[PDB]
Paper text:
Proper operation of the pivotal CME cargo adaptor [name] requires membrane-localized Fer/Cip4 homology domain-only proteins ([name]). The [name] complex, composed of α, β2, μ2, and σ2 subunits, is pivotal to mammalian CCV formation, and its deletion is embryonically lethal in mice. FCHO1 and [name] are similar in overall domain arrangement —folded N-terminal acidic phospholipid-binding homodimerization F-BAR domains and C-terminal folded μ-homology domains (μHD) separated by a ~300-residue, low-complexity intrinsically disordered protein linker, which has been suggested to participate in [name] activation, although how it does so is undetermined. We dissect the network of interactions between the [name] interdomain linker and [name], which concentrates, orients, tethers, and partially destabilizes closed [name] at the plasma membrane.
To confirm the identity of the extra, Cμ2-proximal electron density as the N terminus of [name] linker, chimeras of Cμ2 alone with N1+N2 attached to the C terminus via 30-residue unstructured synthetic glycine-, serine-, and alanine-rich flexible linkers were then created, crystallized, and their structures solved at resolutions varying from 2.0 to 2.6 Å by MR using an unliganded version of Cμ2 as a search model. The Y pocket is variously filled by parts of the tags of an adjacent Cμ2 molecule. The N1 interaction occurs mainly via complementary charged interactions between Asp318, Glu320, and Glu321 and the Cμ2 BR3 [name](4,5)P2-binding site containing Lys167, Tyr168, and Arg169. Isothermal titration calorimetry (ITC) measurements showed the binding of [name]-N1+N2 to have a KD of ~25 μM. Mutation of key binding residues in Cμ2 (E320A+E321A+K326A) reduced binding fivefold, and mutating Tyr323 to serine rendered it unmeasurably weak. The weak density that follows on from N1 adopts a range of conformations forming crystal packing contacts, which we believe to be nonphysiological (mutations [name] Y340S and E336A+F339S have little effect on N1-N2 binding). Whereas N1+N2 binds Cμ2 with a KD of around 25 μM, N1 alone (i.e., deletion of N2) reduces binding by ~5-fold, demonstrating that N2 plays a role in binding [name].
Numbering used by the authors: 152 to 219, 240 to 437, 477 to 489, 497 to 502
Write the structure that this text describes.
């Protein structure tokens, strides 16, 4: 009974790391079309899990998710994942490639945590004025902070001048872009902010009702709008004898805005050790 030799094409043998560790990045884009009254007309999240594996040997990994939450409509796995166990047990088990790879990508349309509601109100005062007020609510944990928030409010062509007021961030009228651009650096959850706009209009000869573009928003969020949460990443190397109890896990959720709209009334060193790449923690290089 001679035994076969196991050669995996995506991971060589003899990977040695001074410090066993791994990175998990849950990257997601949330998309939205919301009515002016707050009705979700469309919404979806595309996401993927990027793993950087700086582990030694041939480690056996089991990635655990908060799904028996996140409702997954369809997902494609990297070849390393054992498709048999995900069929029956819903387990994600693999010996990962060395370095960075995409463990899975997925799509979500249900139970989506929309990080921002935009409540718009545009009032008409004759053909020479247009009074705009826009509120944004952050509907996540107060513990968390959103970055790079930008709100785009469309202005009609015949805008002759705007005076804008806000108490958060900055708001500049960009006539070439036909928009008021409202940039906020940071904002916590369960909060509100508001912008005020008095827009002056030159009346035209049409009296054709202005067909509004939607109000769009850009932002980053430190969680997954799909609701996905990393429960565990168990590791076991049988030959070197180490488990995830001996490993450092670095986990990060980056939630991005995709099209988020709301209508407004319309490698090895000398000794055989692999070197990590480079780019404030007690254990980071």
């Amino acid at each position: 009974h001679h035994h076969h030799h196991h050669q995996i094409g995506w991971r060589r043998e003899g990977i040695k790391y001074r410090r066993n560790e791994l990175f998990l990045d849950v990257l997601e884009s949330v998309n939205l079309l919301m009515s002016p009254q707050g009705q979700v007309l469309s919404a979806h999240v595309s996401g993927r899990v990027v793993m950087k594996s700086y582990l030694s040997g041939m480690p056996e990994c089991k990635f655990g998710m908060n799904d028996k939450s996140i409702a997954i409509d369809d997902c494609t796995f990297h070849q390393c994942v054992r498709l048999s166990k995900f069929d029956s047990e819903r387990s994600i088990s693999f010996i990962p490639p060395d370095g960075e790879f995409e463990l899975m990508r997925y799509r979500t349309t249900k139970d989506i945590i929309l990080p921002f509601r935009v409540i718009p109100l545009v009032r008409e005062v004759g053909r020479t004025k247009l009074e705009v007020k826009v509120v944004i609510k952050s509907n996540f944990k107060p513990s968390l902070l959103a970055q790079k928030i930008e709100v785009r409010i469309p202005t009609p062509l015949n805008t002759s001048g705007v005076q804008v007021i806000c108490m958060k961030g900055k708001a500049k009228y960009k006539a070439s872009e036909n928009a008021i651009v409202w940039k906020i650096k940071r904002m916590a959850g369960m909060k509100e902010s508001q912008i005020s706009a008095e827009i002056e209009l030159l009346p035209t000869n049409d009296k054709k009702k202005w067909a509004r573009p939607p109000i769009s928003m850009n932002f980053e969020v430190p969680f997954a709008p799909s609701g996905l949460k990393v429960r565990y990443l168990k590791v076991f190397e049988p030959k070197l004898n180490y488990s995830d109890h001996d490993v450092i896990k670095w986990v990060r959720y980056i939630g991005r805005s995709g099209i988020y709209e709301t209508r407004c009334g319309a490698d090895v060193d000398e000794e055989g050790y692999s070197i990590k790449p480079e780019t404030n923690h007690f254990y980071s290089s």
